[PDB]
Design a protein around this ligand. Structure first.
Ligand SMILES: [Cl-]
Ligand SMILES: [Cl-]
Ligand SMILES: [Cl-]
Ligand SMILES: [Cl-]
Ligand SMILES: [Mg+2]
Ligand SMILES: [Mg+2]
Lengths: 181, 180, 183, 180
């Protein structure tokens, strides 16, 4: 059955490199046979519909990126049904006005249980996190204490850093909206 | 364009101020720098980037302030910068002086004030030349070394923690790593 | 022989450390040309599923000959049927479903002297861990990340002669293998 | 191409600790994917063949030792081709009947410029040394004068001591033959 997906990528359109023009990428994916292709902002949030199996889509996209955008070396790919399931188990604090709220989306092929063990080893300070099914909800309470959080101090040190796609809560919401189309 | 840089830091891996090179190289890779390499353990890092130098300096300052807060100055220079310096080496820089050091300037340094401070020192059995990236400073003899301004006065200057000192062999190694 | 049987073919050591490269789409096509049917793969670590009515002995010989020519770094493999796997599911340790820090299944490979593997494993001094010898391999649970580096699993498995002749999968992948076989 | 390497370590199998059982280590390295793994004596002379890049092999071995033999903090890793290049430039005195002939092999990551400056600072007596590509050839001529040599009196003082891997000339020769 036709399924809608969100395809999220990291590390693009920053530092004057890894350039991806959204209009071009939407056209490319349309030309590969993905339907109703849309995007949001410029960090790599792509939505499309397909009847192909998830495994087929992952192989297609891996092949496409390896040839045409080889700096895209990880991506998250999740369905409307996956996201709806996540929306049924949101932390109560996720809706509150914390200073910063980020969602760390897992990517295809990620060793999630190892990520969880690594995150669990960090000593958390003025922050709260919850392991969801598509990624990690991670809230930091205050701009006063932000620089002392494990999020701020240690994320660049973790082995999984380039293999997660990080978005703020505003974009997390928008991803859900765009999946419902 | 894609530019190769040397990032040099003072005061690490001595006494404390611990930095594991393999960790730093991976952290800088995560920060977005490419083809990150290091030489020995005193803080000689090489990377490629097409980002503007001003954005590189800001990213690195922010990075060190969180991850290695004892790194409170650094030198950042390009291959092109180094090659320009190599075209105006003092003739004495190639001779067997007892000691030869290069004092690399750091980002944000008030170079004109450094030059005024250094010119105020009474030199003895030594010669120095103000280059574009820093100061070439040769001391002729071990016998006379303890009477040199380099020995007697460098710890007395305000700019000491804001220069990165390397010996001549390491200065050459930095150029070779930039050219790789 | 006599019935169309669904098999899992598991290999170790591929697509890691910048070598031992196997492209899944290529392998699926090549095994289809070899005469295996409905060939599917899970992820990239070497988990292949196929259907065949050929005898297991002939399947093993054909696969050995195939790898020797096409992927000579594949020097052992596990080959098991849906029936085999369902039999293993009837005999899971009670702790295998619990929230241990790490759970792995060490799948035996074709031609392996299982009795030697058992004797070697039994010679190891276990610490914060538990293992059970199943039909298709060894269930091996490690209770905690804080004690993991003191386990025999961690300290000694690179020392054993059988290491390159078992195919290690985590419990989540063990489950996925069963799901892929049952399709 | 398949390349043969020698992997040399120091400080093992002495002083009642730092135990490495050669048969175990050979098996471990085989299990990591290294081929035709062999060893000589018990001081840490291992030989293996691989298609992996030198950089890949260094990282593989560093990671392995840090987890499984953390007292192996340095190592020498050199190819047949490296050794053959060294064999084209042997000192003429290396075949002569000196009382003692040793080779100080450099290790991965060693600050070789530092080592060279430190060694050059020593006052040599009845001995001769030559700086090769892979390390230092160091001959002591006579049993009667051995106790006055810098090799005997000063080597233990150097900061680099635990970061080089010392072999006698017999073992140096054997390393070459095991490389093929
Ligand atoms: Cl965002
Ligand atoms: Cl000043
Ligand atoms: Cl004087
Ligand atoms: Cl020896
Ligand atoms: Mg847990
Ligand atoms: Mg001769």
């Amino acid at each position: 059955a036709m399924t809608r997906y969100a395809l999220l990528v990291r590390g693009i359109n920053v530092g004057g490199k890894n350039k991806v023009v959204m209009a071009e990428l939407r056209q490319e994916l349309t030309n590969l046979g993905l339907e109703k292709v849309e995007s949001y902002i410029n960090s790599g949030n792509i939505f499309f519909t397909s009847i192909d199996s998830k495994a087929q889509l992952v192989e297609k996209l891996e092949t496409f990126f390896a040839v045409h955008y080889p700096f895209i070396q990880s991506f998250s790919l999740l369905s409307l049904e996956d996201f709806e399931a996540e929306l049924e188990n949101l932390p109560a604090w996720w809706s509150r006005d914390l200073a910063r709220k980020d969602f760390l989306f897992y990517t295809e092929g990620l060793d999630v249980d190892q990520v969880i063990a690594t995150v669990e080893s960090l000593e958390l300070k003025d922050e709260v996190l919850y392991f969801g099914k598509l990624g990690i909800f991670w809230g930091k309470f205050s701009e006063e204490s932000y620089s002392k959080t494990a999020y701020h101090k240690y994320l660049l040190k973790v082995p999984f850093y380039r293999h997660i796609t990080i978005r703020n809560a505003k974009t997390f919401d928008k991803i859900g909206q765009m999946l419902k189309k």
